Every structure is written in structure tokens, then in C-alpha cells.
């Protein structure tokens, strides 16, 4: 059909045909595959927490940095108006 | 395996309030309650062969639940917990009948 | 058929034909192949945990570094606007 | 007679809507699920574009 094999497992001895083979759950019985891959669970879930919190920290820095950015520009524009009329200040002074 | 027994084979649309114990690629052991919205299909509801093919499997409820549970668990096995929860219904529904049509 | 041998194990003495040979499970009985290959289990699963957590750390660094990257550019563009009107500042000042 | 097809239509409707709602809210943050609460839950039930 790498590539898929077939859809028939035939036994020529009696004509018994296994149409498909289904396996339910991999048990592994030992307690050491068990809550040691469970520490693997804890690490493979902590990585997800760290990734999402890092991305949110970056977006928080996004808000902070964009804020500081037009903070600068508006400090700037208000100093613009202040100097525009400091013109009249120093003229008349 | 064998709990209910009735004289009639329900062909009308129904569901199975089945819960599976699956494990994703992040090993996250989670149980999950399923429905399996099912209904029997007969194109010719008089032919003896097709009509008797209804009673082919004697535990069709269990067969449907086990097959869908197996395929769902196998497909969620290939995805992280983050993926299995972002596209939860998406991946489980493509798990049941994986194809492209 | 490296290459596959045949599909028949025939005994000419009596005509007994072994169509196929199936072996179920390798036991090894000793306790020292046992939970010592089980420490092998712990290592061969910890390697998987380390690999996935390292990849997630790299993707977290991806989010962090892309964030810092346009953090720089937006600091930059807001300073652009601030200097654009610092032009008027210093003109009139 | 197709009305009596499902014998527990109340439960069927509740379970189907609950499943689809939970699956769709699963893809959004808590902030999003509370900003567009009704919006995302109502598109969760019958997700399409018409």
C-alpha cells in the first residue's frame, strides 16, 4: 500500500483471517517505569508552564516598553509647547 | 465486558456514556468521558443477509466503545498535553475517523 | 527469499512440518538483568524528559528573544516620533 | 416517530453542548473566556461562519 503493509493477516492452515489487530494500552508493569516517568511528567509539564509564563512576561514587557515609548514622545511634545511659549517668556523678560 | 442484556438490538441513534483512560505524549494520564453518537445504518431494510448482519457482533456497544477509545488514545499519544487541550475536540474527532475529505 | 530464509521447517523423518515458529516473551530470569536494566529504564526515560524540556526552553527563549527584538524596534520607533517633534521643541526654544 | 429516536434527548442535548463548549473554551485563556464569555460560548455551540 514506511508504507502501509496490507489489511489481511491470513493463516493458510485453517483459513483463519485476522482482519485487523488492536492493542489497548501499554501497561509497563514495573514501578520504575512508573513514578519515574512521572518525574518526567513533572518536567514535561513545567516546561509548558515556563514557556507560557515567559511569553506572557514578554507581552508584559511589550506593554511596558510601548508605554515608555510614547511616554518619551509625550514628555517631548509637552516640552515642545512649553518652549513654544518660553519664546514669549524670554522675549518679554 | 458483560453487564446489560436485552432481547432487542437498539438501532435508533443513541450514545455511550463511556470514560477512557488515555495518555498523551507528555504522559499526562487523564480520564475523559465520551458519548459516541451512533446509529445503525441499513440501506435495504428487508434483506435477510444485511438484516442479520446487525447481530454479527454480539456486544456492539463494547465494540464501538473499545475501537473509538483505542484510536483516540493512539492519536492523542502523538501530541503534547498543550496540543491535546488546545485542539481537544479537533484532534479527538479526527482521531476517531482520521482521513482527509 | 539479511534476506528472509523460507516459510517451512520440515522434518523428513515423519513429515512433520513446522509452518512457523513463534516466541512469546524474553524472561531473563535473573534479578540482575532485572532492576538494573530498570536503572537503564530510568536513564532512558530521563533522556526523553531532558530532551523535551530543553526544546521547550528553546521555544521559551524564542518567545523571549522575538519579544526583545521588537521591543528594541518599538523603543526605536517611539523615539523616532519623539525626535520628530523635538525638532519643533528646539526650533521654538 | 423520529422525535422519539433518542430516548434521553434532554441529556443528549446537554452533553453535546457541554462537550463542544468545554472543547472550545479549552483553546482560550481565562482572560479571553471572560472578556468574550457569551461570544465564545455561543460560537462554541454552533461554530461556523454565516
Q: What are the DSSP calls for A22-87, one per residue?
A: --------STTTHHHHHHHHHHHHHHHHHHHHHHHHHHHHHHHHHHHHHHHHHHHHHHHHHHHHHH
Rounded to 10 deg, the angle between the A34-92 and C34-92 helix axes is: 10
Does A32 reach chain C within 8 Å, measured CB to CB?
yes
Q: Which residues contact C74 (CB under 8 A, 6 or more apart)?
A: A62, A65, A66, A69
User: B89 CA to chain A: closest CA distance, Å?
Assistant: 20
Cell numbers at B42, concatenated = 441499513
Cell numbers at A18, concatenated = 485476522
For residue B19, list its beta bridge partners: B33
Q: What is the C-alpha end-to-end distance of chain C, expressed in Å?
A: 95
Does A35 reach chain C within 8 Å, measured CB to CB?
no
Contacts of C38 in chain A (CB under 8 A): 30, 32-33
Contact B28 A41 (CB under 8 A): yes
Q: Resolution for this model in angstroms, one decimal place?
A: 9.8
Does A72 reach chain C within 8 Å, measured CB to CB?
yes
CA distance D26 to D35: 15
User: Which residue, A33, A31, A34, A5, is CA-closest to A20?
Assistant: A5
Contacts of C66 in chain A (CB under 8 A): 58
Q: What is the CA radius of gyration of chain A?
A: 35
CA distance A38 to C45: 10
- B7 secondary structure, DSSP code: S
Helix (H) or strand (E) holding D26: none
Does A51 reach chain C within 8 Å, measured CB to CB?
yes
Amino acid at each position: 500500500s514506511l508504507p502501509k503493509a496490507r489489511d489481511q493477516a491470513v493463516f493458510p492452515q485453517n483459513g483463519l483471517v485476522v482482519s485487523s489487530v488492536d492493542v489497548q494500552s501499554v501497561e509497563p508493569v514495573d514501578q520504575r517505569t512508573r513514578d519515574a516517568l512521572q518525574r518526567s511528567v513533572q518536567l514535561a509539564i513545567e516546561i509548558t508552564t515556563n514557556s507560557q509564563e515567559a511569553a506572557a512576561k514578554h507581552e508584559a514587557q511589550r506593554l511596558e516598553q510601548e508605554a515608555r515609548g510614547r511616554l518619551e514622545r509625550q514628555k517631548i511634545l509637552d516640552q515642545s509647547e512649553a518652549e513654544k511659549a518660553r519664546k514669549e517668556l524670554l522675549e518679554l523678560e | 465486558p458483560h453487564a446489560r442484556r436485552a432481547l432487542c438490538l437498539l438501532l435508533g441513534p443513541d450514545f455511550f456514556t463511556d470514560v477512557i483512560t488515555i495518555e498523551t505524549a507528555d504522559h499526562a494520564r487523564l480520564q475523559l468521558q465520551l458519548a459516541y453518537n451512533w446509529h445503525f445504518e441499513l440501506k435495504n431494510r428487508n434483506d435477510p443477509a444485511e438484516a442479520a448482519k446487525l447481530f454479527s457482533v454480539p456486544d456492539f456497544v463494547g465494540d464501538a466503545c473499545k475501537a473509538i477509545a483505542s484510536r483516540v488514545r493512539g492519536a492523542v499519544a502523538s501530541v503534547t498535553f498543550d496540543d491535546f487541550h488546545k485542539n481537544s475536540a479537533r484532534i479527538i474527532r479526527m482521531a476517531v475517523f482520521g482521513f482527509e475529505m
